[PDB]
Amino acid sequence: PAPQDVEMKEEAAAGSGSAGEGDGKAAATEHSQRELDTVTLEDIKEHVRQLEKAVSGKEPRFVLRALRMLPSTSRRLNHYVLYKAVHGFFTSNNATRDFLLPFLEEPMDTEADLQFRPRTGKAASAPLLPEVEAYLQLLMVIFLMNSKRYKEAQKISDDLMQKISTQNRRALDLVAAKCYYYHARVYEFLDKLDVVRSFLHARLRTATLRHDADGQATLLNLLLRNYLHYSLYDQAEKLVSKSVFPEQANNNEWARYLYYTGRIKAIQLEYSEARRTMTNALRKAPQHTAVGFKQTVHKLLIVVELLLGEIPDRLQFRQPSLKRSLMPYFLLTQAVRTGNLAKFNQVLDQFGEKFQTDGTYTLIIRLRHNVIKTGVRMISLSYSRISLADIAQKLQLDSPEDAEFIVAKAIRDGVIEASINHEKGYVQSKEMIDIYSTREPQLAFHQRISFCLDIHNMSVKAMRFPPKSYNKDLES
Amino acid sequence: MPLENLEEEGLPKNPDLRIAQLRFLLSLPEHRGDTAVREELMAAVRENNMAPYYEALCKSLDWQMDMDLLSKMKKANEEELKRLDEELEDAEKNLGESEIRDAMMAKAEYLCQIGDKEGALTAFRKTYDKTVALGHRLDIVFYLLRIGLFYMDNDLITRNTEKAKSLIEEGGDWDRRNRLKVYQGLYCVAIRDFKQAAELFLDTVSTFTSYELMDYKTFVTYTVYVSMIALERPDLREKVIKGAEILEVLHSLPAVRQYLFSLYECRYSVFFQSLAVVEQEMKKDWLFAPHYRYYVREMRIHAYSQLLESYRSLTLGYMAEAFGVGVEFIDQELSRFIAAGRLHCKIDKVNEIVETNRPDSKNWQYQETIKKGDLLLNRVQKLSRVINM
């Protein structure tokens, strides 16, 4: 309802714009500016703004709020997100979102925070013209997470974004970083087959020379992510060896990077680092982006744990309240703790179709071997001698002969620590349950202490961290 | 009297029987006047699994409430408020401090019986501010705790307990200190760990004179049941068996008495017989476990451990028979029992001697430091990652 649309827009445009411009302009306060802009602003634009009041688009006023390019060609993108093709799956404005130049009414009022059109328009060797361009470009493509829109204003958005960029600056890469994430997503996330790649690589080259960490970080994640979805995995594996993640990247950037890296090492046969990277991503960044990811992360995570050699408990399923999403997985877990082969194959097959989706399919075969490995550890540990035939029946192996061969391999790996006596008709337990006997109580301390060293370093550094900014702000 | 309300909410939760329990749950709240709140309380009862309320869209409407009860309670609660406002008008005419407090505090408890939490807090609040008897002060704060235990919201339980806990010790009343132990005792069965609960109950039978509590006999029957779960033969033997008090009183216990006796005789044939039946019998009727897995798992470790500790070798037949279940089931159970490190036995089925190495040693205590440290260790990393952003 246009008479009601105008209050909503004016407030929204001013509030979001004010925070991006007041922060950017200071230009030498790089750490604060980088953090505020990446996490807070983009997140504000997604979750609070859109949802607030009647009609999710508050875009038409906004285009005029700052400046993109002076003819109404670049503006046109603002109309296209509103209506063309699909029209997204957001609530669009009735009118006053005009094809060419959305709005007739400025909210600019010659501010430094809401700009002025000819005033920004002079800039092209100043950071004032590239920053404004980007903020508006970002806002327009911000609807894409929520909507999962295709071929509206995202047809020329890739090209238009390259135009905004030039040889950039360290301040300009920090604002531009927000745009880089959406640039891949429009063809990536939908999985239209197109080249998002050219641009992504190209910004990457430029940002490394200037050495702006925010920019490089975003590109590397997308490049891995794009490949895996396209089903061109080979490309993603080779990429990692050439990558370097900055150590001064922000918390969202790290979470996305870590999840994506985690799926890759899991394929290689490295479960140990794969589980840790996926868990930490969820706490590191609670984002509204994060909501789409979480179901996949837990689903993939469980199959990934079973392979490492831990069998997860029931409780873990219960707490994140996503138990239902987890539910077909939960059955696979109950099957490993019992250790019986026969149950695993049936369950995993019917369910298997769903599993293909997460990225689990490659792994799925290997989960067969964990079930038996858990059965072998229980047989050797519990008793001394039980007949080979009793074991054959219990796990539901095909033959009593089949039990021998599997037991024989397991000992070599050395996880079991038993002896199988083939001729005598039994397994002998060579192991005894202990952790104080050999050199081993020291190892037991080692692992306990080891997890701690990391926690200590983090607690202490983190404590100091707000005071580091106050110290810089000039307080003792 | 009110402690049964708390036990009854607990029964639909038991994974051993969902449906029968619903009929147990209804009975006492219908008498007391929980009807009015019950529309809001019903959502908590769904998590616990099924409710037979008139507005319930749950499976069992086989013992569905009649519409007239909901309405009768509601008129009654408004009528009670109408009398109260008027009491309040009268109060200024006498003493401000005495008359307004007595009425405000009485209104809170009434609100608490219904299970209206919000109305309780406000009504109580004024009375705390004003001078009132120390013993009375401890009973009213327990009622706020009592509403939460019915409601089965876990976070809620914590707040009340900590506050009450300071006021009891400060005070001179020993008898009242005991009352808090029972309420907290319900809390202990409510969470997974049953072990914690037994101790509160052993104290409370001695001292917690009847008022806000059932009859002496129904309380003693709870007392022995819970003592058996935590305590092994030395502990059980000294505490219960030694006493003068049981002989003087005279038994009315025999079913539960057999379950306590079997452990002492160290014949697991008698134990296991009493265990399949007792589990079903006691647990269903009154809550000591909303999570049935914990109860049997802990009892079976003790029954096997205790047989093994005393006797190195046994025949398979004796082993199968005494324990109860299949040889197959027994052999799987053991593997889990071994992992703990307190059991450490080997079984030869091919030579039919089950040997028990049984190391009482430093390794047992060592094992414990290493094991416990794990939960905490994982948990800080998670706290620290939250605090920093």
Binding site: - | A276, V296, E321, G324
Partner: peptide, 24 residues
């Protein structure tokens, strides 16, 4: 872990009675 409680009560009473006859 797995739900041992549902299975043990039924098994313990029944199996034990047959075991009495079978073995000492």
């Amino acid at each position: 872990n797995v739900e041992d409680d549902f299975s043990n009560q039924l098994r313990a009473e029944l199996e034990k009675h047959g075991y009495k006859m079978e073995t000492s």
